[PDB]
C-alpha cells in the first residue's frame, strides 16, 4: 500500500496531531481553531494524543460523539453565542494554567468559563433556536471545583445547578465539590456534555452556576464517507480512492489486510496474506468485535 495519508478525491483530511477529538471539538488552546479544515475526507488521530482536553474531566458520551462525528464531513463553526454581547452580566475571560498556550493561561476556544461579574452570577436562561436548517452539535460543561472556596469565588453559589432542555432532551446537573487528585496540575474537573439539536429545535440553557457555557457550536452536515482514522504516518499529498490508517490503496485487488478502521471506496478486510466504547460497554465491544470478526472470516472464502 501507498503508505501515506493520501487524499480520497482531492479533498484533504483533518490532522489533529497532538490534538484529539475531545479537544478538537472543545477547541484545545494548543490547537488551531481548525477553521482551515471545516471539510475533510477523514479525521486523523494519533494513538494517544497528549494534548486533548487541556483541563481534566470526563467527556460524557465521548464514545458516541466520536461516532456521530465519524460520519460528518463538514461543519459550520458558528458563534452560537458571541463572546461579547451574549453575556453582559457574566465574566467571559476565565482561564486556567492547565490550558496554557504560548503563555501562562488561556481557555478552550469553543467554550466560555462563565464566572461572576461584579461578584454577581445571575441565574442565566440563554437560549438558541436552530434556524440553520441542519443539525447543531452543542457542547457545554459543568465545573466540579475542588472545594467550596473555588466554587463560591467563581460562581458565588454553593447548591449550584445546570439545566439543558430541547424538544427531546432534558438533563439537569448538580456538580459535586470533589477534591480529586491533581491532573494536568488541576484538581477539580470539567465534565463535558454534548447534544445534537435538530433543525427548528431550540436549546435552552439555565444555570445558577458552574456552567462552562457554549461559545461556538457546529451546524454540521452529517454526510457519509468519513471516520476517525488513528495512525502515525506522514501527511504528504497523494491520491487513491481508498484510505487505510497505514496508507491508501490503489485497486490492484478488492482485498485489504491493513488496519480495520477504513474510510472511502475501500476494498474488503481479510487476514489472509471507527467505533469505541468504555468499560461498562464490554458487551457492546464484543458485539462489534464479533460483528467484525465473523464478516472477516466470511470475506476470505
Amino acid at each position, epitope marked *: 500500500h501507498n503508505g501515506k495519508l493520501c487524499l480520497l478525491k482531492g479533498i484533504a483530511p483533518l490532522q489533529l496531531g497532538n490534538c484529539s477529538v475531545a479537544g478538537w471539538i472543545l477547541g484545545n488552546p494548543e490547537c488551531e481553531l481548525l477553521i482551515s479544515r471545516e471539510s475533510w475526507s477523514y479525521i486523523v488521530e494519533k494513538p494517544n494524543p497528549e494534548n486533548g482536553t487541556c483541563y481534566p474531566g470526563h467527556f460524557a458520551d465521548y464514545e458516541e460523539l466520536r461516532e456521530q462525528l465519524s460520519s460528518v464531513s463538514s461543519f459550520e463553526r458558528f458563534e452560537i453565542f458571541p463572546k461579547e454581547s451574549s453575556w453582559p452580566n457574566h465574566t467571559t475571560t476565565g482561564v486556567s494554567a492547565s490550558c496554557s498556550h504560548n503563555g501562562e493561561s488561556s481557555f478552550y476556544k469553543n467554550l466560555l468559563w462563565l*464566572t461572576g461579574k461584579n*461578584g454577581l452570577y445571575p441565574n442565566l436562561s440563554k437560549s438558541y433556536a436552530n434556524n440553520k436548517e441542519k443539525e447543531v452539535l452543542v457542547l457545554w460543561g459543568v465545573h466540579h471545583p475542588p472545594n*467550596i472556596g473555588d466554587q463560591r469565588a*467563581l460562581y458565588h453559589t*454553593e447548591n449550584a445547578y445546570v439545566s439543558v432542555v430541547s424538544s427531546h432532551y432534558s438533563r439537569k446537573f448538580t456538580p459535586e465539590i470533589a477534591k480529586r487528585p491533581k491532573v494536568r496540575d488541576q484538581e477539580g474537573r470539567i465534565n463535558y456534555y454534548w447534544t445534537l439539536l435538530e433543525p427548528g429545535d431550540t436549546i435552552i440553557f439555565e444555570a445558577n452556576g458552574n456552567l462552562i457555557a457554549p461559545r461556538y457550536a457546529f451546524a454540521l452536515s452529517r454526510g457519509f464517507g468519513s471516520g476517525i482514522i488513528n495512525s502515525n504516518a506522514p501527511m504528504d499529498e497523494c491520491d487513491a480512492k481508498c484510505q487505510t490508517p497505514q496508507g491508501a490503496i490503489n485497486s490492484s485487488l478488492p482485498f485489504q489486510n491493513v488496519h480495520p478502521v477504513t474510510i472511502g471506496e475501500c476494498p474488503k478486510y481479510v487476514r489472509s496474506a471507527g467505533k469505541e466504547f468504555n468499560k461498562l460497554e464490554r458487551r457492546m465491544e464484543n458485539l462489534n468485535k464479533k460483528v467484525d470478526d465473523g464478516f472477516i472470516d466470511i470475506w476470505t472464502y
Partner: antibody, heavy 119, light 107 residues
Framework: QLQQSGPELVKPGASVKISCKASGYSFTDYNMNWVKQSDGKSLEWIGIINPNYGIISYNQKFKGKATLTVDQSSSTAYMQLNSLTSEDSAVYYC???????????????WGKGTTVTVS | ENVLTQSPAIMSASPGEKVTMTCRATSSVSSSYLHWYQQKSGASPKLWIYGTSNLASGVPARFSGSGSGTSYSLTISTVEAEDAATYYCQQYSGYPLTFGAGTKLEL
C-alpha cells in the same frame, strides 16, 4: 497563620510590591483577599485572587491601581501598587476566605499588615 | 452599589455592661453573608462572628448577632476593658465586599 513583607517608604509614582505567605494550611484551597486600611480609617476590600484558578476580581475603586497574583510553590500571594500617591500610605492586609457550608465571604485569618508609605 | 453604615460611631461604656451595635445596608444582604471582625489598636483584625449569629473560635458566647435584609446587629452581654475594641461589619452583595467603617469602644 500568614506572614508578610516589611514596612516600605517610597516616593510617588514608584510602583511597589507587597507579599504574604501562608503556613499551617493548604495554600491552594482557600481564597486570598487584600484589604487596605489607612491609619485609624476605614478598611476596604481591594480584591481577591483565587489561588487555584487565577480568577482575579477587584473593587472598581482599586481596579488597575492594584494587581494581584500568586505563586503556588511559594504558597505566596503578591499585591502590586501602580501609580502610587500620598493617600496610599497605609497598612495593607492580606486575608483568607475560610471554607464553610452555607456561610462564606468571611476573613478568618489576617496577616500582620504592611505599612507601605509615601513621602 | 452596596455600602453599609454602622452605629454608634463610638460607644462610651463600663465593664460588666451590655450593648448592641447595628450595621445597616444600603442594599439587601443575606443573613448567611454578613460578618463581624474584632480590631484593636491598628493590629490585624480578627473574625468573631461569621454567620450573622454564629460565633467564631476563640470568642466567648457573650458575642451574639441577629438580623436580616438591610439591618443586622452585633450584641455583647458583657463588655470588658481589655476585651473591647473596634468592630467592623462586612457583607457580600456582589462585589465589592465593602465593610462598614468600624464602630469604636472608648471603654
Amino acid at each position: 497563620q500568614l506572614q508578610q513583607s516589611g514596612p516600605e517608604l517610597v516616593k510617588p509614582g514608584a510602583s511597589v510590591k507587597i507579599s504574604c505567605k501562608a503556613s499551617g494550611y493548604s495554600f491552594t484551597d482557600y481564597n486570598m483577599n487584600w484589604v487596605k486600611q489607612s491609619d485609624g480609617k476605614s478598611l476596604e476590600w481591594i480584591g481577591i485572587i483565587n489561588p487555584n484558578y487565577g480568577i482575579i476580581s477587584y473593587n472598581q475603586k482599586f481596579k488597575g491601581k492594584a494587581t494581584l497574583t500568586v505563586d503556588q510553590s511559594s504558597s505566596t500571594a503578591y499585591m502590586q501598587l501602580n501609580s502610587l500617591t500620598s493617600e496610599d500610605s497605609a497598612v495593607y492586609y492580606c486575608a483568607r476566605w475560610g471554607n464553610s457550608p452555607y456561610y462564606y465571604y468571611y476573613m478568618d485569618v489576617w496577616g500582620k499588615g504592611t505599612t507601605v508609605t509615601v513621602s | 452599589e452596596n455600602v453599609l453604615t454602622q452605629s454608634p460611631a463610638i460607644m462610651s461604656a463600663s465593664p460588666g455592661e451590655k450593648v448592641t451595635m447595628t450595621c445597616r445596608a444600603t442594599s439587601s444582604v443575606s443573613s448567611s453573608y454578613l460578618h463581624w471582625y474584632q480590631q484593636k489598636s491598628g493590629a490585624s483584625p480578627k473574625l468573631w462572628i461569621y454567620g450573622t449569629s454564629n460565633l467564631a473560635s476563640g470568642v466567648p458566647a457573650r458575642f451574639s448577632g441577629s438580623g436580616s435584609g438591610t439591618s443586622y446587629s452585633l450584641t455583647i452581654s458583657t463588655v470588658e476593658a481589655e476585651d473591647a475594641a473596634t468592630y467592623y461589619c462586612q457583607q457580600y452583595s456582589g462585589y465589592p465586599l465593602t465593610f462598614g467603617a468600624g464602630t469604636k469602644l472608648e471603654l
